[PDB]
DNA sequence: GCGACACATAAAC
DNA sequence: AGTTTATGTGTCGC
């Protein structure tokens, strides 16, 4: 009934079929590593502004809630939360150096203001985009919102156990414990060490995330989970790393910029999951029917 | 099949 | 040690 795999950090992922077994909502058995991500492609090259060195980039994503591996399929539930986390790394540049440097897109050179991640859901068979929604912990007693673009600096991805532990922390002392893992506070650096043109100082806010954490995520309530043939639709979750540039023929999305104008999120790299099945609200998707 | 409201139960403190 | 929080899911009414 429960199939167990050891995660990288020694925690377990415990896969079970909610059609057959009901587990408590706050059980640690609801936390588990989801499907592994794969490269879709690399897009615009990025170079350091004096050396000309190409910046090596890699997205490091993981799903930590919401998906079970059940007989060779990855299965989620429309009504339930998933968690998708991601960082990125720069193989050839340590963070401290990276933040003092400046970088251009090779298209002919657009200056990078900052790096950021976004996520999307798609129908994996036809590339149609599917809406995602997020809640706060208050769920129906708080607002609903669509996942946002997350400015980020390079960082290792926290272990599954760390994401689990930090999921519902309010206590101030405990929050302090995790702060350095999730945030860089630009207002606490020595400003005299940095040039006006430095990458750190073109980030839009002082509080800069080191990890993009999309928690309490669902597919939009209106998604059809089956095809007309009654076969399951196949979905995929995508993570896109971009460079945000000032707007004034390569893939990009428009972005609501800080100063009011509309800039460009220029694609750098994209990863996606294998095909995903989503179980809808039908009673037959739950053990209560049996 | 979906929005709303309800109940239940382990985590968080 | 008890209370509140957070979240899977049961149920009602259209």
UniProtKB/Swiss-Prot annotation:
Main location: nucleus
Keyword S-adenosyl-L-methionine in annotation: no
Effect of residue 18 to A: Reduces DNA-binding by 70%
Induction annotation: Induced during prophase I of meiosis. Requires protein kinase IME2 for initial expression and continued transcription during meiotic divisions. Can autoactivate its own synthesis.
UniProt site positions, description: Interaction with DNA: 26, 79, 139, 170, 216, 281
Localization per record: Nucleus
Any one GO cellular component localisation term in the record: nuclear chromosome
Gene Ontology terms for molecular function: DNA-binding transcription factor activity; sequence-specific DNA binding
Outcome, altering residue 27 to A: Reduces DNA-binding by 86%
Self-association state and partner proteins as the record states: Binds to DNA as a monomer.
Function statement: Transcription factor required for successful completion of meiosis and spore formation. Gets activated after completion of meiotic recombination at the end of prophase I. Recognizes and binds to the middle sporulation element (MSE) 5'-C[AG]CAAA[AT]-3' in the promoter region of stage-specific genes that are required for progression through meiosis and sporulation. Competes for binding to MSE with the transcriptional repressor SUM1, which represses middle sporulation-specific genes during mitosis and early sporulation.
The protein's name: Meiosis-specific transcription factor NDT80
Residues included from the entire protein: 33 to 335 of 627
